[PDB]
Amino acid sequence: AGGLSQLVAYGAQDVYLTGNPQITFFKTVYRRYTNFAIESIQQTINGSVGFGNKVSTQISRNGDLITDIVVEFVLTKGGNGGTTYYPAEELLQDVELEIGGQRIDKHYNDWFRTYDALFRMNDDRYNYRRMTDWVNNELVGAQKRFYVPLIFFFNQTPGLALPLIALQYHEVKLYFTLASQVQGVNYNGSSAIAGAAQPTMSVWVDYIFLDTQERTRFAQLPHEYLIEQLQFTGSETATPSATTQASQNIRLNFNHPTKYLAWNFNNPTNYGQYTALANIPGACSGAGTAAATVTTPDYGNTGTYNEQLAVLDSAKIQLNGQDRFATRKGSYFNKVQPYQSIGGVTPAGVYLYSFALKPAGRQPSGTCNFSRIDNATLSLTYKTCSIDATSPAAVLGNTETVTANTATLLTALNIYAKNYNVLRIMSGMGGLAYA
Amino acid sequence: AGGLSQLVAYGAQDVYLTGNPQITFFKTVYRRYTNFAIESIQQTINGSVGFGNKVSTQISRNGDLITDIVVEFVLTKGGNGGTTYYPAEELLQDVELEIGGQRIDKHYNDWFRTYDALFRMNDDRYNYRRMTDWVNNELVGAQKRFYVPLIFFFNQTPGLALPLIALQYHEVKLYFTLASQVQGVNYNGSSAIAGAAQPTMSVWVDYIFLDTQERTRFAQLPHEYLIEQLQFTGSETATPSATTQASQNIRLNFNHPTKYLAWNFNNPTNYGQYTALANIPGACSGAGTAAATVTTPDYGNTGTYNEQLAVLDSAKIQLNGQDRFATRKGSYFNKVQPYQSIGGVTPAGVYLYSFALKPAGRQPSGTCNFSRIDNATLSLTYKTCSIDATSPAAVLGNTETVTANTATLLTALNIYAKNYNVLRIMSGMGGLAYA
Amino acid sequence: AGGLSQLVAYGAQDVYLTGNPQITFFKTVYRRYTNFAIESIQQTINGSVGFGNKVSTQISRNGDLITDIVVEFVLTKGGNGGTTYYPAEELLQDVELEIGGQRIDKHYNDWFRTYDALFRMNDDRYNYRRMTDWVNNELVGAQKRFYVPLIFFFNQTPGLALPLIALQYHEVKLYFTLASQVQGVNYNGSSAIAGAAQPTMSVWVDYIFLDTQERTRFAQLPHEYLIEQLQFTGSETATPSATTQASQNIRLNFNHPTKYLAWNFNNPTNYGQYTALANIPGACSGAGTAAATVTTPDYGNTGTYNEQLAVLDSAKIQLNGQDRFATRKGSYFNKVQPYQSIGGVTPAGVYLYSFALKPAGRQPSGTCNFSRIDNATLSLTYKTCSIDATSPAAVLGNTETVTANTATLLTALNIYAKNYNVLRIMSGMGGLAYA
Amino acid sequence: EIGGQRIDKHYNDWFRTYDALFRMNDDRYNYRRMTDWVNNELVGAQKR
Amino acid sequence: FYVPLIFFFNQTPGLALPLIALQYHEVKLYFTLASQVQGVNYNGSSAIA
Amino acid sequence: ATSPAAVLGNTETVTANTATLLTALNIYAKNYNVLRIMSGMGGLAYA
Amino acid sequence: RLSAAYAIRAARISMIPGGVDGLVINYAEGGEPAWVQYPLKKQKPLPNNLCYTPTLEDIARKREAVIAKYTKQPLETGTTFTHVLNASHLNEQYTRVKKSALPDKEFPIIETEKYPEPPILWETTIGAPSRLFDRSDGVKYV
């Protein structure tokens, strides 16, 4: 009886699982590793901060290698709960990474949002929102400290820690552009909020202190860091229309080995709005009641999983004029691609197409090298904006090929591409191999 | 002060972690890998797709290896939000996988529901739901494109990609049975919904294109794979009495090294109903008020974690008349087993018993080989159906050994077993080594 | 066209990813592992179980190695839904582990709560709650079985399965303390609940049965396991007030290479309360209405993400009299630390500080050796308790440096540390190599 | 900080404590003259 | 407004400052802004509210 | 555009309502090629 | 699960690729044997194929050669004169090249800066653990 009665039930079919055993599960041997320590050290931010300001910081030589970078912001609510949407993310308009004067990479507030929408998840995602927004129904005047992590290649894994010690002669710095306005903090839609406070900003960098043998190797030896970069071009969305199906062909001026493309349609009026407004709960300011308006979003619920409010009917990518894959529906890029390649849940209006087997990881796993493709074009077919946004019967009872009349407000398109490059470091200097 | 203050605090107790170091964390060298690309190719479905029809497709020889397969459906709501439950999953009654005429595997709509309930989790499970149901309160007549991924062994990991390339003489086919009825789409309880549309359908296969060296290797060498198979036995339950505890001994006609067993009790009328219904929120149509009907479920909220509505009091598995483990409570199988073995949360009415350390993974980690068990039997004890389901107090305030009077509707039991077989490919042909 | 059009887009930039390929992604070779089986076997409890009792149990040598241990309890509700909070966790006041009589480790009910708060996530965390509490609005008189998994080092991975087989001359025993009171089960705040049932208890151990070759090696050879230990000291919190920011220097009586520190402030009366009470939904008994009281929590919603109710303003860890890192805000330790190092969401009032890259893993990744630190201390600064907890305007619209007047009820502080030691087994006996 | 490493650190209170113990006579007064307003200056008065 | 500087290296490529040859030196510009600018923040001696 | 106060007292990022009439865009590039003459005849080096 | 005479004929009947060789087979009824694997069939045939096509690496060598060629030469040279007088010269050339045949390597700045002095190992320190001097925690109990 018991476990032994199963243990003894052996035979030919078990040989392929446990015959000639190689490994057990009950003897884990850990690896011995080089002694190291990590300290989170505050950096000095040069230039005035405030809304619309642009500042920068050199990362100081406190340790040998750097990884995580966190920007601390102090914001005060300019209105009540429901008026903000990830305001710390909205505030940090962009961040540029420069090494030795060469632009290595650059992130955008919208990317931080798109990136999150695609790659963070579950509790990891909720924590992130806790660090960038007000999620406990806070009221006007509330003060909160928000932490915006950076997502540059060296901020993703210790494996790509930037060896500042191996960059003896090159400055390393980040440039941070602050948004002119942040919703629910200093502006409410198009109106400014009188008396709103300006942000306080601080940048923390996590430094790795190595022991002597490891420190020496980094300082002494050449390195080749296989890293990822974000490419980004913003453009006009073929404005959705209530009379027909708009279409658009965007030649993608991308390069390098690309893991994936990502894109969204948005209403430039409101950070994070990737969908149409409607009088259904969470789809607009006051949605579901008499006070509902489909001209202004419920800022606290700006993002949604309600596909009927999305504007992409279908899409395909062509390489040198030929289809890369068969045309698929917008909902395929929104729901399936992330299912297959990431495992998270992507909001309506945000789309992903992977050329990679595992785009959410660090290990390259298949890429589309656009430096070898003369004409890469993204073809987008839009839904017909025939649905009256103020009437739930129409908003919710409609067909696959249509969307809200308010979907015509989604006039901006953001197309991103994530790719590999090589950051070579030698003789105290570093920079990218390809462009 | 700072990080160096940690490094300096070195002694004898550090030797076991950092002495004679083997690794670092700050220098990741990625593996070079074979170059590949993945294409989504639409397959032709032979036969008429519609409710109750059986259709099939042969996977074309477009790429070298195949992994993910997604079956798309387009359904129109036959009623309002809350009247459907994973209708795309319900529609795809079963899927049969065959190579060269040999049946490799076969899945059922209920398996997809059980599989999901046990193995997908968090945002992944939600994203899945978004691809199979209407989760944004859509209304009658709404049209939606669903994506139902297949979960055969080659559809879950790249590691098991099926080598069509090495199957030069064998057709690989999928046969799909569509349900005669889908709740909230073409039927509402026992009634048909006049005017309901027939579903559309499309089968998509993700084909991997290999480089020459890898492609050649695959095409000529023999291959051997550990693959998964689903065994399934549907049977009548020892439906519990309102006066006592029914019990049952179910002969399990299973074979092969089994990773795990899983099962559920259900109301065969209502897809996904694994529990009793009651006048408590989410537990029935109109639950919580006077109009509640405890014989009609809240379809949109069919599932629940409220064990009070489950019917298994306790269970054990016998091997050749010998107890395999001490009798444990139904909640032990429902909550602890998956805690330990999967790490997700299992809905009430669904039970798991693992023979493996990590059954949710590909790598075998302990099996029960039923090919060597002359008499495998599942022993069940049911709860007493004495609780008046129409009285929330009766339900919510009761004891461990009892359930709802409506729990007598759980007349069907589905017992699944997931096992390992050996797939062999050579000289253009493929098949499974063991019966 | 198709996937082939991507493969051909190939050149020098791809060498770093696919030149001289070493691996593939489309073929997995599974390791052949040893033959074993798992059985859950009930242990006998020596001593009476009831509220406030201390019992012990010896683990039977039924199998060769052990991993998971689950303690089952049967509790009844002494009040309605909302009156209990993880009561089975609260009940298991503590557990000690000894081998040969040498204490190896010890866990506390508060640690289980802290551990969960920091390391379990998503559906893992939810499923856990389902096994220790009532989560479906059960009512007074309801009776349920709870399963409390233990969190000793061998209960976390098969890799550390305890080799009872190699401990032929040593007894392995657990000691358990059952709480004098459990909220909503036998007491409501300070008031005893007449008629409350005493808990039923059962201890289950999951045994691994090894085959002949593996069993022989374990029985005869010496072993060294790298294991985890929990260190803990409870102490008084310097209590803040409306007019002052209390501060406190807590000497840390810790030793060994430490993976991380963790701590919380709490109301010792209310299990799991790590934050102040307030008249906002879920933050107190009756919160949001006229009947609200800010002296008693909504027990079923005791925990919260609303940091405004947290007490800690800022903190630093000092080693050998010197700052480890710059002083940081309580929200850093509550949100950023666990975001960066664990990926879960830590509730308000619970703080983490890692000295390691992966505190949630088994593999050591940077440690602080307190055996080489003579003057370690945790220096805390508290927020002023000026906010009127009964007034949402004050509770929700306040500043970073202030908290609820009810935060002065958080007078107890629990500081934990997790370190690495070595459990050696030789000639049938074993114990820890270092203090 | 030298070379990325803290050598020392002073605090406003230390400066006050240090002065209280170690500066004296007119050194202390001259010091006060450089850190405060000691000639009964009025609101809005500006000083380096 | 754009105020070009008129330092020697700001007038001709011929005098471009070789930052590259100044590998170990910093180049800095210090700018003092006027307390008052006519017609912008002051009108003669009067501040402009 | 019809009100000098609005036309002249405005901000950096705005212009006249009549600025929407500037619907045409002309982009030029002035570049260098090589004109080659040989044996009585000629043409450009690059095309 | 029959006693090998049967498993072998079954493999033939069922068209198991190859056949038994490489399989593990059960014998009799119990007292469990069958750790026995039949050795992989001798001379498993390599069925005639045409799987060799230029490898991607071979393609990269060719594409890089093309890039080098066009970096130095025009894509196409006109032949408009050719035989006109002695003007083998004066033909226009086409220099715009398909992106896929353009070089893509950024300026080698890290190979060109030539700092006047070599880099050093940026050692930093906090000094000796003065409370850790002459204190040995590595003692075997004697």
Side-chain angles (χ1 to χ4, degrees), chain A residues 26-262:
Chain A
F26 313 115
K27 185 180 176 181
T28 296
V29 180
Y30 63 91
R31 298 281 78 81
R32 300 181 300 271
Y33 65 95
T34 302
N35 186 29
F36 71 95
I38 299 173
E39 187 182 2
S40 182
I41 300 171
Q42 185 171 1
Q43 301 298 303
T44 300
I45 301 168
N46 296 323
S48 297
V49 299
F51 291 104
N53 290 113
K54 182 176 177 181
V55 299
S56 68
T57 192
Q58 293 182 54
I59 299 171
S60 66
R61 294 183 177 271
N62 285 109
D64 301 303
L65 314 175
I66 60 171
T67 56
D68 292 358
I69 301 177
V70 178
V71 182
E72 182 182 59
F73 294 100
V74 184
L75 307 176
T76 58
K77 289 181 62 48
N80 290 322
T83 62
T84 61
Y85 187 71
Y86 298 93
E89 300 181 2
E90 184 175 19
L91 178 58
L92 185 54
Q93 178 182 290
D94 61 47
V95 184
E96 180 179 355
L97 173 66
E98 293 177 350
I99 300 176
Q102 186 186 40
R103 179 177 298 181
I104 304 301
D105 204 354
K106 185 172 181 185
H107 292 292
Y108 302 90
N109 58 1
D110 189 72
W111 181 242
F112 281 96
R113 177 64 180 86
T114 297
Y115 175 79
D116 187 69
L118 294 172
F119 295 96
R120 293 195 181 83
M121 61 185 77
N122 304 326
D123 280 350
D124 181 4
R125 175 175 286 174
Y126 183 61
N127 189 321
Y128 180 78
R129 187 171 190 177
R130 290 178 68 205
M131 292 188 292
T132 63
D133 206 352
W134 286 267
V135 297
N136 301 281
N137 301 319
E138 293 89 343
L139 301 174
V140 65
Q143 186 181 52
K144 187 172 287 294
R145 290 179 177 273
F146 300 91
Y147 303 105
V148 179
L150 283 298
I151 56 171
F152 291 108
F153 68 90
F154 61 88
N155 300 131
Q156 295 172 0
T157 179
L160 298 175
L162 186 68
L164 296 180
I165 197 168
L167 297 169
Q168 291 88 325
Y169 296 117
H170 284 177
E171 65 274 27
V172 178
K173 60 172 65 169
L174 299 178
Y175 297 87
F176 306 92
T177 302
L178 304 175
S180 65
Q181 62 179 68
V182 178
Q183 171 64 46
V185 179
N186 66 330
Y187 293 89
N188 188 29
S190 68
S191 296
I193 300 170
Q198 298 299 305
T200 298
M201 185 180 168
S202 179
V203 178
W204 293 338
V205 178
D206 293 354
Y207 289 88
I208 298 159
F209 294 82
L210 301 173
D211 198 355
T212 297
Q213 291 178 358
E214 182 179 1
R215 183 176 62 252
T216 298
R217 287 193 297 275
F218 279 103
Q220 183 178 33
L221 303 177
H223 305 277
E224 295 178 319
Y225 292 88
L226 179 63
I227 63 168
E228 61 174 58
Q229 298 177 293
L230 181 70
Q231 298 176 65
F232 172 67
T233 299
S235 69
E236 179 179 353
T237 299
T239 301
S241 174
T243 62
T244 190
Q245 293 190 257
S247 64
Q248 188 172 14
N249 297 287
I250 301 170
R251 187 171 184 176
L252 304 176
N253 59 351
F254 293 138
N255 58 18
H256 299 268
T258 297
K259 289 193 282 200
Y260 62 90
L261 303 181

Side-chain angles (χ1 to χ4, degrees), chain C residues 83-311:
Chain C
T83 63
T84 60
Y85 188 68
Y86 295 85
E89 193 184 66
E90 185 176 18
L91 180 59
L92 194 156
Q93 180 179 310
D94 62 42
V95 58
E96 301 181 11
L97 170 68
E98 294 180 348
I99 300 174
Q102 185 191 45
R103 179 178 290 156
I104 305 301
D105 206 355
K106 185 170 190 166
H107 296 270
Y108 306 86
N109 57 4
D110 190 72
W111 177 244
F112 279 89
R113 177 64 180 86
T114 299
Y115 176 77
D116 186 70
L118 294 171
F119 296 99
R120 294 196 181 88
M121 60 185 76
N122 305 326
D123 289 349
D124 177 19
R125 180 171 63 78
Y126 177 69
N127 192 60
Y128 175 78
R129 186 177 183 179
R130 292 176 71 206
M131 293 188 288
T132 62
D133 206 350
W134 287 268
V135 298
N136 301 282
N137 198 27
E138 292 87 343
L139 302 173
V140 65
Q143 182 174 31
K144 297 288 183 291
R145 185 176 301 268
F146 298 96
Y147 302 89
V148 180
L150 304 182
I151 55 173
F152 289 101
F153 70 90
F154 60 84
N155 298 135
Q156 298 296 293
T157 179
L160 298 176
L162 188 69
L164 293 176
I165 188 169
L167 292 166
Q168 294 91 335
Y169 302 114
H170 282 177
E171 303 87 347
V172 178
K173 298 184 182 182
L174 300 175
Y175 302 83
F176 298 90
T177 302
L178 284 78
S180 64
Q181 63 184 63
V182 177
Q183 170 64 44
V185 178
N186 65 330
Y187 294 90
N188 187 28
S190 68
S191 296
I193 300 170
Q198 298 299 304
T200 298
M201 181 179 162
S202 177
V203 178
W204 292 80
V205 178
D206 294 351
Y207 290 86
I208 298 160
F209 295 81
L210 300 173
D211 201 351
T212 299
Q213 291 180 352
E214 181 179 2
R215 179 182 300 179
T216 299
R217 288 194 297 272
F218 275 104
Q220 295 179 335
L221 300 175
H223 306 280
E224 295 182 358
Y225 287 79
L226 180 66
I227 62 90
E228 300 177 2
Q229 297 183 287
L230 182 69
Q231 297 179 55
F232 169 72
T233 300
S235 68
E236 184 176 1
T237 300
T239 299
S241 190
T243 60
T244 186
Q245 295 192 260
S247 66
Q248 186 177 12
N249 297 309
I250 303 170
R251 291 193 297 274
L252 300 177
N253 196 34
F254 296 140
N255 57 13
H256 302 300
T258 297
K259 183 190 183 69
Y260 64 87
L261 304 182
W263 63 96
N264 68 57
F265 301 90
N266 65 74
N267 182 332
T269 299
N270 300 322
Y271 178 78
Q273 183 183 341
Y274 302 112
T275 64
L277 303 176
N279 190 16
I280 62 172
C284 70
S285 174
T289 190
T293 176
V294 296
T295 62
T296 300
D298 181 356
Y299 286 104
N301 293 297
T302 298
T304 188
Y305 292 90
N306 189 346
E307 59 180 0
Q308 290 173 313
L309 299 175
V311 74

Side-chain angles (χ1 to χ4, degrees), chain B residues 1-3 5-6 9-14 16-17 23 25-26 31-39 65 121-122 125 158-161 208-210 214-215 218 224-226 305-308 324-329 331-332 334-336 339-340 343-346 348 353 357 362-367 393 396-400, chain C residues 2-4 6-7 10 15-28 30-31 33 36-40 68 70 72 120 122-124 126-128 130-131 136-145 147 149 158 204 206 226 256-257 319 322-324 355 357 363-369 371-373 420-422 434:
Chain B
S5 71
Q6 184 178 321
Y10 177 82
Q13 295 181 25
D14 291 297
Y16 61 86
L17 302 178
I23 65 168
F25 300 106
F26 309 111
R31 296 279 75 80
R32 300 288 182 84
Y33 66 97
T34 57
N35 192 282
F36 65 93
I38 303 175
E39 185 178 356
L65 311 175
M121 62 185 78
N122 306 336
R125 185 164 67 195
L160 297 174
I208 301 100
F209 294 84
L210 300 173
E214 181 179 3
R215 181 182 301 179
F218 271 99
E224 298 179 355
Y225 295 82
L226 294 176
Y305 298 105
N306 187 2
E307 70 185 274
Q308 290 175 316
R324 174 59 181 77
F325 60 94
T327 303
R328 306 297 292 275
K329 302 298 296 190
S331 65
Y332 175 92
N334 183 244
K335 297 177 183 178
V336 176
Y339 178 78
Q340 291 174 288
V345 62
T346 299
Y353 184 79
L357 294 169
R362 298 297 62 91
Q363 169 69 59
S365 56
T367 60
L396 293 171
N398 67 49
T399 189
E400 186 175 46
Chain C
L4 293 173
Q6 182 181 322
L7 291 176
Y10 186 84
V15 170
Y16 284 93
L17 279 70
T18 62
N20 194 32
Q22 297 171 310
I23 65 168
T24 187
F25 294 98
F26 298 100
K27 179 67 177 71
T28 297
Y30 293 96
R31 300 296 300 276
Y33 64 97
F36 64 90
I38 308 299
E39 188 180 2
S40 184
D68 291 350
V70 179
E72 296 182 359
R120 294 196 181 88
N122 305 326
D123 289 349
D124 177 19
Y126 177 69
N127 192 60
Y128 175 78
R130 292 176 71 206
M131 293 188 288
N136 301 282
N137 198 27
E138 292 87 343
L139 302 173
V140 65
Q143 182 174 31
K144 297 288 183 291
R145 185 176 301 268
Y147 302 89
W204 292 80
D206 294 351
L226 180 66
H256 302 300
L319 305 175
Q322 294 172 34
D323 293 346
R324 176 59 180 90
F355 300 106
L357 292 166
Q363 169 69 57
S365 54
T367 60
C368 179
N369 185 350
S371 297
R372 306 292 286 164
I373 301 172
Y420 294 90
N421 203 324
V422 178
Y434 305 97

Side-chain angles (χ1 to χ4, degrees), chain A residues 411-430:
Chain A
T411 62
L413 165 61
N414 293 347
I415 301 166
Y416 299 94
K418 180 60 66 70
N419 66 278
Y420 286 100
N421 204 322
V422 179
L423 176 60
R424 295 186 295 157
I425 302 174
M426 62 191 72
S427 298
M429 299 172 282

